[PDB]
Amino acid sequence: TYNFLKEQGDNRIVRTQALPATRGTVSDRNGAVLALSAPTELKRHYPMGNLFAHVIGFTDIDGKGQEGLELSLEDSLYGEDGAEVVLRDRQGNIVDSLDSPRNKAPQNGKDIILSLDQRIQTLAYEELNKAVEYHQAKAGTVVVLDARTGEILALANTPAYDPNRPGRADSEQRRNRAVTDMIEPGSAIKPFVIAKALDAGKTDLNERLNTQPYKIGPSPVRDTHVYPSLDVRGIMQKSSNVGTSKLSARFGAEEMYDFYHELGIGVRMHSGFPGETAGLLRNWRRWRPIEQATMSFGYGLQLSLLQLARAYTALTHDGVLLPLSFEKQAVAPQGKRIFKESTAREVRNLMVSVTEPGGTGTAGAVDGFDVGAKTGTTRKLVNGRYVDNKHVGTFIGFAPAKNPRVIVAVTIDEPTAHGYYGGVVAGSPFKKIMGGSLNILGISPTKPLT
């Protein structure tokens, strides 16, 4: 009759039964579901497969975050499991619900709206893969940012994996390269050096400097071609190592160090993503003049592609460096003033000349727009030393150049076929991703289509 009152037997077993919380859902900025849980316990589903593989990561068999945003957001995503005490029989039938202070309802996890746009993510995914496959590269990465808010609109690496089946996935497939890997920025750092020299009035628009190759003691500093003299525009346009290192040489070692530091080089971003690289910025007290010089053209210091993309917000957001967001923002976060509005505006105008006839990155030109960009290729560093065959090409820029809306950054790792230069290998995916992104965002061309 009253089973609850009786001694336990083989046919009446007191059981504490889990009432599992529903894990938070992850969405794109427009409402599209990217991660959700379904009963089986609960099971995690990524409807879009490998598209947001690195950003979102995965959970373990117990519904705990293991990698990506699943790991770093674990606290608000999980919720709180509930429980109830029941009397069951040997088949598992609930015979009685038992009075207990242990009976608790579950609290579902909190839902997250990412700042990322699946339209832009798709476009970045497809073009990245096309470039990697064509150039027979080992790997690649793309970051797309909102140039005014610092919101991440897209972030993909290849090779990737299906987060619905993370068990077969390699270490190399699982690595979120945009956030975990530091690279030499090479030519990509140059606009910052030029911007600094302009900002502090160490140079101006119409100074012509001697850009002949020279020596810092024994070690030579040269360009690809001899340019007797160039103005600041020429230095930008031709990506002159000589002009850049000379401009940098007008500041002390400490002052250049503080600057690279304020740009985010050599510390963790604290973006909220797990496994962030700290990068590399050697203590200024150890710099010789040659080292200051090679740093000025992007050797001897390192940062992730995500850090590089972020530094570009100082150029696009009128001299104010923005923190990045993976979460949808109502409004631009407060940033840190790096250059005057006046300087950034001038420097954006200068960078347009790298993508026009005469510049070093004409392949990143987008029909109907002025694009400011830099591009280059460095030899790959494998444990503080160089390999033989192996290069890393990068292309980064923004549009519309006068009033920027989008930053796109692409890196291609170990291209093997059909070129080595960043301007070609990372330039076409840049071009397609940029143009597609401007179109998705409803941004009007500023000049007629050729």
Cβ–Cβ < 8 Å for 351, 345: no
- Rounded CA-CA distance 243/46 in Å is 50
- What Rg value do the Cα atoms of the chain yield, rounded? 26
Cβ–Cβ < 8 Å for 183, 410: no
At residue 194's C-alpha, the angle toward residues 191 and 199, to 5°, is 115
Residue 76: active-site member: no
- The catalytic residue among 115, 187, 240, 271 is 187
Cβ–Cβ < 8 Å for 202, 230: no
Q: Which long-range contacts (CB under 8 A, 24 or more apart) does 33-42 make?
A: 34/114, 34/118, 35/70, 37/63
Q: Which long-range contacts (CB under 8 A, 24 or more apart) does 380-386 make?
A: 380/413, 380/414, 381/184
Alpha helices in 279-340 (DSSP H): 289-296, 305-311, 313-316
What burial class does residue 286 get, using C-beta atoms within 10 Å of its C-beta: 0-12 exposed, 13-18 middle, 19+ buried? exposed
What burial class does residue 425 get, using C-beta atoms within 10 Å of its C-beta: 0-12 exposed, 13-18 middle, 19+ buried? buried
- Give CA separation, 304 vs 171, 205, 269, 424, in Å: 18, 31, 10, 21
Residues, the chain: 450
Question: Among all residues, which ones are annotated catalytic?
Answer: 187
